[PDB]
Symmetry: D3
Subunit: 240 residues, 6 copies
Amino acid sequence: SQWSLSQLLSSLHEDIQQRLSVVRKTFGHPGTKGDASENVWIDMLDTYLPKRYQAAKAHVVDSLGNFSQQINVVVFDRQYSPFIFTYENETIIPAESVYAVFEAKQTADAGLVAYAQEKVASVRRLHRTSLPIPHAGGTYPAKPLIPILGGLLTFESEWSPALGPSMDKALNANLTEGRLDIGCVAAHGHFFYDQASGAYSYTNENKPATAFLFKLIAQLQFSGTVPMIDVEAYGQWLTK
Amino acid sequence: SQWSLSQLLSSLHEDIQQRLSVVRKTFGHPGTKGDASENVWIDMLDTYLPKRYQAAKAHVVDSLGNFSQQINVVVFDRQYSPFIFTYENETIIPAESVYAVFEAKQTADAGLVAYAQEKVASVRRLHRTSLPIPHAGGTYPAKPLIPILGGLLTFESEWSPALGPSMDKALNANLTEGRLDIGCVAAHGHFFYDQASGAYSYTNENKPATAFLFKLIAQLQFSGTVPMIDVEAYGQWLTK
Amino acid sequence: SQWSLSQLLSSLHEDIQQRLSVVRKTFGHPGTKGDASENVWIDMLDTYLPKRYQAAKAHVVDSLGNFSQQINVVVFDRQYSPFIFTYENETIIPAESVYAVFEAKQTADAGLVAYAQEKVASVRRLHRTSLPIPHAGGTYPAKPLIPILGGLLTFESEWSPALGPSMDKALNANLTEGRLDIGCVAAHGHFFYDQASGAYSYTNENKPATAFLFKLIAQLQFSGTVPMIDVEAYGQWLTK
Amino acid sequence: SQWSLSQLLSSLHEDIQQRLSVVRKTFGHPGTKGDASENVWIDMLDTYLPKRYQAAKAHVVDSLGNFSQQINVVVFDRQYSPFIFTYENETIIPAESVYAVFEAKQTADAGLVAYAQEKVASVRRLHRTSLPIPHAGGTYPAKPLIPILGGLLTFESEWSPALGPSMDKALNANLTEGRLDIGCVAAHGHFFYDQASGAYSYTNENKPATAFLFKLIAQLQFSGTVPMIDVEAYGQWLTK
Amino acid sequence: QWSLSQLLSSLHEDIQQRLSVVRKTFGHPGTKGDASENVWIDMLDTYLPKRYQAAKAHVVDSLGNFSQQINVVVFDRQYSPFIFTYENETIIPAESVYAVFEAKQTADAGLVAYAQEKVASVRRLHRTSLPIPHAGGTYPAKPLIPILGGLLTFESEWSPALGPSMDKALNANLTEGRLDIGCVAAHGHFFYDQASGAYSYTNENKPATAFLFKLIAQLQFSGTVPMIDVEAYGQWLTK
Amino acid sequence: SQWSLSQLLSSLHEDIQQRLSVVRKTFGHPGTKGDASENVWIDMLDTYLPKRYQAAKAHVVDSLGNFSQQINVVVFDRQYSPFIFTYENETIIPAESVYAVFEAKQTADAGLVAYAQEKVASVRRLHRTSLPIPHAGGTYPAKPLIPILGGLLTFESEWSPALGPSMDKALNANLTEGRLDIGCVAAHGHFFYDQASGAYSYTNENKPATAFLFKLIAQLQFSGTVPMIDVEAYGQWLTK
């Protein structure tokens, strides 16, 4: 009956780990298991992230007509950004709306790390517009393009411990367009890329999903709001 | 990744036990903990019971103007029954709509058993009308009044054994208006009253919340649908 | 402090009268005022009628291709009946689904009574199919067609007293296809057509909206469920 | 301007065909296109079927521990049937709840017909319990088991004519556990198995999605409500 | 295989198709109008940035004056209260408004004039504007934003739809009732070019999508609504 | 018929007073009455406040692990702030999210004023972080903390006049950490603390709930958006 902040943060994490564990052992069909697992991560972000952020599955498109791969957990703006197309509950968002790109799967291994790196690169390669921003105090120059964070969300790992030499090799194989900035292995720990030191930081236990959530919120704060989209750049495709 | 019926039933139970456990250790304020605990039990019944059943907190009233105590988990009909009054999300249902009456609290002990028995009695004492029932085949005579099931829902038990002779004593103290027909102690097992043998049956472990849910569904099937309410009996209070 | 069934019934009515009063004096556009008033009546029925009944605005169609007028408050089945067409939140239901037809307007007068009678007649003139009914015991012979109840719902009356000779004259002008069986003038009383005596019964005050609701439920009970629709009769209109 | 029953039925169909056509030409990822297409069919059935039917994706389980394949469009009862397990929006239903099983894909061809027949057979092979049914008039004998309807939903056909001899040969390859009783090829027509004649009936054009919907409703009516489930048979799996 | 051009074409085709079904299927005029408005509101609710709300409403100002009924208004709720909402009908303050549209099935001279009067009925309202507290301190009160006016239809009575007859109708009001943007879903879109002082017309080219993109681009210049002085409304609290 | 701004404001208030009056006389059980009364006030704020404000029941926690009392109506940010924990519909928010704190009860008296003062103090004692704010134009200095508004919401008063010497005495007993800045006695008037004069301002009648709402919105505007939370201060509790 004593309130405890540590207990709140532990329970947030325990809920995520428990739900992912139930999904893993109970749903026999791999597609069903994957859909339910993604549902957990999207629910966590929808529940806890500031409401300036949306979290969903989508494809990303740019004004040059290029498309990302399917992103199973994308974090994006809707306060200042349209969808490009949404129909029958499937969605394509403009590249200018994107804050972060994650690949979610039940188990981390070398193939999944490389797959996530490529998913992230498929978004970062897209072209983003940026217009001068009218506001209450006048007009800002166009905002410089924000970083798009990349990451991986799993329950388990092929490696034990999950965050060891094999994971470190896999992550360090792509520190450029496919760089993963943050990730969570819910049964084991979380990681983030420290730009000041140029290396990954790993934490085992210590409430992994909550640690991931808090690091993501803090990292996202540096991005501010997405730059202002030039929708008329997309409008060039109305005639061709 | 193989499908297992036993795993489905185990996961249903484990989810309930886990949510109640998180509520108990995380919410320091008693009212908050109680409200969250009741939310779990109501969510379980709303999710799994056949849709002919509603589950909610309510008071019960009869056409004699008498009221039950507050029932924190009542199972009732809405397909054939009106509310008597619902306002600002608080609700009063007619006695004729009731299928089952539960008291949900943290731990089973002598005082809670007696309190739950009195809650159930406060509903069974109410008067229920019953009219001949028009249907596709003609008209049935008024349905004989259905039993109202009584029950208790807890996480823990103060007794040792949890479902042992001390519990059996408290339950056998009221086999009439306050009789409890079914109950769940989520950390320990479930019980039910066997009318054929005139005694209680106890089962330890065996996925307690799922075992409770399945027994409740089976017991409810015997009640069929509620008898047909005479709403004009309540209308006698329009001139009073 | 003390529970009172009479108070529950009074408050139910007072809520409806107050909401209609606020709509009447506050919305200065006639269409807005009408829409808001209809919303009150539909909310009352949706909240309190047994869930076997739907309440909404709709047109009604039959398998002979005939359409009713627009019905602003129709009570109908959806448990056993399809929509014929629903699109952009506007709806057409089959005649076999209908239990009751109401016209809602702010004030009762000679023109409104005649208008409501014509609305009801426009539904009663429609053809209703009825098929033998498969059920748990086998197949019942086709259910004989149920009466469709007709009515009016207003707040005020041009006549003072509201339910006097002028109302009785208007109501008795149509006792066949346009007969109104039940009605509520929320600020004054309710009426119903007594088939045994062949005359209207009027009740002033006595919590009019609650009195109306209880009479409507009691009258509807005699209809049971709608007869079983022959959807293939509508399917005759699939040819080019 | 003028109401037309033929137009209502034509617009219902045209809406389905247009939505499926947009999905087909607009979503460039196969999983996304498939999900959106299934969404259209499920939306159609959820919107228009009587509310006694649920329509969703699910797996089916029986009281012998056997599971079906993943069913992308299942029509089932929830008024009288629990879920066996639902978690993170993915669901397993008992075999006793099932009315109809469909496979939904883009184009009809020999492989898809055989795949759909096997999907249906994977449900029909499951064991279904049936108990005596308590009701207002006493207790019915256990209801004899109802057929489960099987079907196929597509947009196009690889064959010319679409519903021609090649389709007929594929359908006639399984008239037992995998028999398809009804199907829709949205751009071309619909089919149904005529038990009296022992052969398939094909209808080209005539508003295919509406014709399919009406035939499905008429077929389903013969099934009445699902027999009463013996949940205690599932409870045998509660033991360690 | 994906195509951005196809996305934009399908967005428009969906709107045109839904409006076409409504027009031919709902025999009752009120039902047809309600369903058509539902399409336009759904399009804007789905695609506009979430800083914009789209609904039917009346507009009121702190001087007690009311607009006509606006069947499609685009307005702020992030920084603005409702003045009154009850039984799902709503009155918004003038300070919340970004854009005012009249939606009907067919464009003709009477509809253009009616839409211009609807827009004027909102622009005549008084809007307050207070200094704005924010993360950096307090901005001076924001100068009042233009309220955009427009029309949304499916068809046109004229040949061509956006031809000389439409141009005459629009040019009859370039002041308080000026329409800045509009869509004739079966034919094209128009906008008022302030630099040249004339209307620009675009035929085909996915009309509803072209309209949506131009609307978003025009709205961006308005930023957020100025900060309402709700206590100006409070003068009507006395007996 | 004629629109009237005066009437809009009168109806807004009259709706609140009517709903609170119905709750007071209709719900016999004190807990039910209190929940329904809180529901009215939360609905009013959720309906009318700008969407940058959330209104709900919650506990508040800070990065030092300290907790407030239970707050039945808190007004807070979610656009830029996470929840710390939300589970089974019960919620804990960070102190940095808070704009205003209210205690809502049916009747004002000396005990309640002191209780509301203690509730507010329990939130104001909490520590609030504030980081430099990234935005479109660069980075702002950390926003200075702004004081949290405190308040009381009731229907009636033990005193007549309600806003008389006894109320003034109770309010002036705490002008520091427990100071109430604004309040409404719905049947009588509203009050606010005038910082310029150092005294309370009382307004009788003048549509109290509307007058309260407008003063609240005006006071809140001065607070702008909450300062930017340092979630890593909370993350210190991940490892302890």
